[PDB]
Amino acid sequence: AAFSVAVCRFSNTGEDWYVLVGVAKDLILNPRSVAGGFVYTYKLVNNGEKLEFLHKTPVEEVPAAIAPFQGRVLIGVGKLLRVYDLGKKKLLRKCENKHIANYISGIQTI
Amino acid sequence: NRFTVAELKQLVARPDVVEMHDVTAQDPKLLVHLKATRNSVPVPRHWCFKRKYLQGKRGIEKPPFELPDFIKRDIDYQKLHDAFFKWQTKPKLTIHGDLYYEGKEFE
Amino acid sequence: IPYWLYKLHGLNINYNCEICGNYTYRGPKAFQRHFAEWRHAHGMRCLGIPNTAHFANVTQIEDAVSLWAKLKLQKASERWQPDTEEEYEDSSGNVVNKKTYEDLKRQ
Amino acid sequence: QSKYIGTGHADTTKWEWLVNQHRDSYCSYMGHFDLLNYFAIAENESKARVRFNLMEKMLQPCGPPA
RNA sequence: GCCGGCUAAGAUCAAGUGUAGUAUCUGUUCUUAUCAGUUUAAUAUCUGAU
């Protein structure tokens, strides 16, 4: 599936623009019964006309947001907001907070 | 014929706002779930008290209504609206759910 | 003396606070008061469970331990969400926590 | 008939409250436009399809002891 | 109200006065006790035995 997209940089990596897309897996609604989620990290190949499938970081909840929080991918999966960084094989959980009320269906970047 | 005060307090996922008298209702789980609202306001403190919140401390010792300075500091032409509608102070009271208790002002 | 007042205010009743030194309190008025006091607080501190607001209406041993365990630091607010992913490989391996990668990079 | 239909009273059961909740929450779905053109985008069905589904769900939704 | 208490913290029976309605006043008792049932959010109350 797919429910979010962003094009941000990474302070750890270089200035190469990196895209991060969300994906659901068996997110059957009515009744709400999802199976999993994933985040695909592309390198934005072709200077904007392609994308290299770098890493598919899994998650036990359907992600619904992504945004650069001071140079980090702030993804809100279910009821948990986690700030991830550049991962050679998967998005590293640089920080986490599970104090979301019911579902994180958005995020802002102040 | 109902869940005990501990069984009905451990089965729920938020016993921090559990009440002893609430466990004897007809649907304790439903009441516990409804009491777990995000930012609601529970029942007042006069649920079980039989003093009506006025008979106990019936000897009130304080002024009835102090004149606010937002309007006090032909009646007035260039200063009446220029002191009440111009030099007005915003009343800073409770925001959302400070339900008045019995005293609620002395403590 | 006031037997009618005793039956009205809630006299002729007690409450067994086992965690509060197995004390014997009064009626419902002292029932809740027995959970927030000096003797009950000292008993809870000597038992090992911290004095939490969720454990106010609790009055037992096994139940107190179950509350101190289940209501302890759950999965939420973990150990800072450790995710180091040291540069020992630069292309694979990220399960190293805040201490594993430190020891891997120190030596 | 139309005395107070829509809400119970002092000893209304939780199931009988949620039943009225869903039965009066779908009428705001079959009648309202934003909450009807928004559900036909998620389920990816036409207006008639979603409306007939919601109408058939009004038999005894929320989990009926029938 | 005064420095936990001095029984002005509650319920309830009979009578008087009066209103469209709410009410107002006088005189009691208050189980000092136990168990079972009804009931009350819990008391209380009532229903029976001792």
Q: What is the topology?
A:
This is part of a larger assembly, with chains A (110 residues), B (107 residues), C (107 residues) and D (66 residues).
Chain A (H helix, E strand, L loop, with lengths): L4 E4 L9 E8 L10 E7 L10 E7 L13 E5 L2 E6 L6 E6 L13
Antiparallel strand pairs in A: 1-2, 2-3, 3-4, 5-6, 6-7
Chain B lengths: L6 H4 L17 H8 L33 H4 L8 H4 L23
Chain C lengths: L2 H7 L5 E3 L5 E3 L2 H6 L4 H10 L14 H9 L29 H7 L1
Chain B binds one RNA strand of 50 nucleotides through loops.
Subcellular location (chain B): Nucleus; Nucleus speckle
Protein name (chain B): Splicing factor 3B subunit 2
Subcellular location (chain C): Nucleus speckle; Nucleus
Question: What do you see in this structure?
Answer:
This is part of a larger assembly, with chains A (110 residues), B (107 residues), C (107 residues) and D (66 residues). Chain A has 110 residues and is an all-beta fold. Helices cover 0% and strands 39% of the residues of chain A. Chain A has strands spanning 5-8, 18-25, 36-42, 53-59, 73-77, 80-85, 92-97. Chain C is mainly alpha-helical. Chain C contains 5 helices and 2 strands; from the N terminus they run H-E-E-H-H-H-H. A two-stranded antiparallel sheet of chain C has the order 1-2. Chain C is rod-shaped and about 85 Å long. Chain D has one domain. Chain D is 53% helix and 0% strand. Chain D is built from 5 helices and no strands. The longest helix of chain D is centred in the N-terminal third of the chain and has 12 residues, at 14-25. Chains A and C meet through strand 6 and strand 7 of A and loops of C. Chain B: The modification Symmetric dimethylarginine is found at residue 51.
| Rg over CA atoms of chain A | 14 Å
Q: Main sheet of chain D, how many strands, which sense, barrel?
A: none
The total of beta strands of chain A comes to: 7
* Rg of chain D, Å, rounded: 14 Å
Distance between the termini of chain A: 28 Å
How would a textbook summarize the main sheet of chain A? 4 strands, antiparallel
**SSE order of chain A, one letter for each helix or strand:** EEEEEEE
Order of helices and strands of chain D: HHHHH
Fraction of helical residues of chain A? under 10%
Q: Largest interface by residue count?
A: A-C, 15 and 16 residues
Number of domains of chain D: 1
Helical segment tally of chain A? 0
How far from one another are the termini of chain D? 22 Å
User: Per the principal axes of the C-alpha atoms, what is the gross shape of chain D?
Assistant: elongated
* Number of DSSP E strands of chain D: 0
Decide which structural class fits the backbone of chain D.
mainly alpha
Modified residues (Omega-N-methylarginine) (chain B): 51, 58
Cross-link (Glycyl lysine isopeptide (Lys-Gly) (interchain with G-Cter in SUMO2)) (chain B): 35
Modified residues (Symmetric dimethylarginine) (chain B): 51
Protein name (chain B): Splicing factor 3B subunit 2
